[PDB]
Amino acid sequence: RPESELIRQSWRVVSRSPLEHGTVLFARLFALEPSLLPLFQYNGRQFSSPEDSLSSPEFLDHIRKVMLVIDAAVTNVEDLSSLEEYLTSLGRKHRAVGVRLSSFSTVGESLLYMLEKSLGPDFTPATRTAWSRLYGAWVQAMSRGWDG
Numbered sequence: 001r002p003e004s005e006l007i008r009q010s011w012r013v014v015s016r017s018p019l020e021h022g023t024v025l026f027a028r029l030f031a032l033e034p035s036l037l038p039l040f041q042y043n044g045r046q047f048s049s050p051e052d053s054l055s056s057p058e059f060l061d062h063i064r065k066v067m068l069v070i071d072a073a074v075t076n077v078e079d080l081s082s083l084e085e086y087l088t089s090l091g092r093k094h095r096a097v098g099v100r101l102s103s104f105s106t107v108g109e110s111l112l113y114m115l116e117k118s119l120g121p122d123f124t125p126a127t128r129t130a131w132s133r134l135y136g137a138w139v140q141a142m143s144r145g146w147d148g
C-alpha cells in the first residue's frame, strides 16, 4: 500500500503531542455540533460552554483515550479486521452514552480539520483521501454497535 504509508507518516507528526492535537479536534467538533456538549456528563453535571470542557480532567482523559484508539487504527491500517470486535463494543458504549450515528460524520470532519491544520502544505489530496477511506472503514466497524 502507498496510502498506508501516507497515513503512517501524517500520524507520526500528530502523535508527538496528542493532547494539543486532540484539543483541536474537540474544539472544532463543538463549533460544528454544540449539541454534543451535554453528552459528557462527569458526575451528573453538564458543561455550560465548550471552554468549560477544557478544564475538566475527565474530559482531557477522554481526549487521550481517543487519540490512543486512532493510534491503534493506524497500527492496524492494513487489516482493521483485528479491531472489529472492540470497535463494535466501543460503538455500543457510545450508543448508550447518547451519541447518534450521524454525529460520527461530524467527528470525521473534525479529524480532517485537525489533520489539515496540523500538516498544512503536507496535507496532500492523496492523504486526505487515504484518511477519509480509513475513517470510513473505522466507522463501518463502529456502526455495528447500533445493530449493523
Ligand code: HEM
Pocket (backbone or CB within 6 Å): 036, 039, 040, 041, 058, 061, 062, 065, 066, 067, 069, 070, 090, 093, 094, 097, 099, 103, 104, 107
Ligand atoms: C463524538 C462524540 C463522543 C462523545 C460525546 C463521547 C463520549 C464518551 C463518554 C461519555 C464516555 C464515557 C466516559 C469516559 O470514559 O470518558 C466515552 C468513552 C470512551 N470514548 Fe468517547 N465520545 C465520543 C467519541 C469518541 C471517539 C471518536 C473515540 C475514539 C476514536 C472515543 C473513545 C472513547 C473510549 C476509548 C472510551 C472508553 C470506553 C470504555 O472502554 O469504557 N470516543 N466517550
Ligand SMILES: [Xe]
Pocket (backbone or CB within 6 Å): 023, 026, 027, 030, 050, 051, 053, 054
Ligand atoms: Xe473543547
Ligand SMILES: [Xe]
Pocket (backbone or CB within 6 Å): 027, 050, 051
Ligand atoms: Xe473551545
Ligand SMILES: [Xe]
Pocket (backbone or CB within 6 Å): 061
Ligand atoms: Xe482511563
Ligand SMILES: [Xe]
Pocket (backbone or CB within 6 Å): 015, 018, 067, 068, 071
Ligand atoms: Xe497517541
Ligand SMILES: [Xe]
Pocket (backbone or CB within 6 Å): 070, 107, 108, 111
Ligand atoms: Xe476519530
Ligand SMILES: [Xe]
Pocket (backbone or CB within 6 Å): 070, 073, 134, 135, 138
Ligand atoms: Xe480513524
